[PDB]
Design a protein around this ligand. Structure first.
Ligand SMILES: CCCN1CCC(c2nc3cccc(C(N)=O)c3[nH]2)CC1
Length: 350
């Protein structure tokens, strides 16, 4: 039977949970009778991205109904929904396109996960636990409850947890010291670049299967530039309360995952407002969206050269920014080196 530690085995059970996948699709009113998990395809999703893209472009021009109407149906025909009765939500605005653009991202990770889960080892020589662990291609170790790292991280989860978005409370149940296969050599070169932070990264649980497998990727061109405030790229944060809002957990699903990947930002291109780009100025290596709140810089610590902004949340120099939380963006998957993976539990007060 399995040799891996219980805590790790449990992790392998939620990231490969089919119910979680179906439940994820049901939230999108996706009639599972027309689009089963085994019906999902990457070629189908891209075709969808293109449509959404054509939609956004249309809205920015003013197609004036019709073209948008048919362009809208062209989507729900490719992505089977079940609105019962009303009028299939017309994608005639940025907000509608962003929501849809967000659905494809998750559905894509689910497609990837559903694939791995069903590799080529349906035998019984090895239990499902130890088998699926392989498909991840990421060595996973459990971090003791009472250790330096644990304390640092857990303390990094407490401080950066303000009272504003305190509609819940975080509790570090498990802490893992992950490290995907290859992110070591691929990150070695960029490792020689000053300003290396240990930022947060949250995402739907049904996506970590693809995250550890594929690794934080950058949205493809077929994908709508809408939604992203700084263009296609990898986004992080220093306020654990900023990434948490991306785990999409709830009173019913309190358990969510979050990452702590080391990122060599180098010379940042500080911005206060949204600005779709993806062509940083000659000299910069990353973008930083100035926010109203920021971890107490005086209480910041740094280890192995990596900076850990585990300082209590305070007011930043400028408040004349649409962002209330910082936001670091890198446009090269090779600049990120996932380090930890927390199995946090959300406790809502209501
Ligand atoms: C279609 C994608 C839409 N939209 C999804 C969320 C993305 C996103 N923006 C972020 C800013 C700070 C932190 C995180 C994080 N995951 O921890 C962020 N994820 C930005 C793009």
């Amino acid at each position: 039977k399995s040799k891996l530690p219980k805590p790790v085995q449990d992790l392998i059970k939620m990231i490969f949970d089919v119910e979680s996948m179906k439940k994820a699709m049901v939230e999108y009113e996706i009639d599972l009778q027309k689009m089963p998990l085994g019906k999902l395809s990457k070629r189908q999703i891209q075709a969808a991205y293109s449509i959404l893209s054509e939609v956004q472009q249309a809205v920015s021009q003013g197609s004036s109904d019709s073209q948008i109407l048919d362009l809208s149906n062209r989507f729900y025909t490719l992505i089977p929904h079940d609105f019962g009765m009303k009028k299939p939500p017309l994608l005639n605005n940025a907000d509608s396109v962003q929501a849809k653009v967000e659905m494809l991202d998750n559905l894509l990770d689910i497609e990837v996960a559903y694939s791995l889960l069903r590799g080529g080892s349906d035998d019984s020589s090895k239990d499902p636990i130890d088998v699926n662990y392989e498909k991840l291609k990421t060595d996973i170790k459990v971090v003791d409850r009472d250790s330096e790292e644990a304390e640092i991280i857990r303390k990094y989860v407490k401080n950066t947890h303000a009272t504003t978005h305190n509609a819940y409370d975080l509790e570090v149940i498990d802490i893992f010291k992950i490290e995907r296969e290859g992110e070591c050599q691929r990150y070695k070169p960029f490792k020689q670049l000053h300003n290396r932070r240990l930022l947060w990264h949250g995402s739907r649980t049904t996506n970590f299967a693809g995250i550890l497998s594929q690794g934080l990727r950058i949205a493809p061109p077929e994908a709508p530039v809408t939604g992203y405030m700084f263009g296609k790229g990898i986004y992080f944060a220093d306020m654990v309360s900023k990434s948490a809002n991306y785990c999409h957990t709830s009173q019913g699903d309190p358990i969510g995952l979050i990452l702590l990947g080391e990122v060599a930002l180098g010379n940042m291109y500080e911005l206060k407002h949204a600005s779709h780009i993806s062509k940083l100025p000659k000299g910069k290596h990353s973008v930083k969206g100035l926010g109203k709140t920021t971890p107490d810089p005086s209480a910041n610590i740094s280890l192995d050269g990596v900076d850990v902004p585990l300082g209590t949340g305070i007011s930043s120099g400028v408040n004349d920014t649409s962002l209330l939380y910082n936001e670091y963006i890198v446009y090269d998957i090779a600049q990120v080196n996932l380090k930890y993976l927390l199995k946090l539990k959300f406790n809502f007060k209501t």
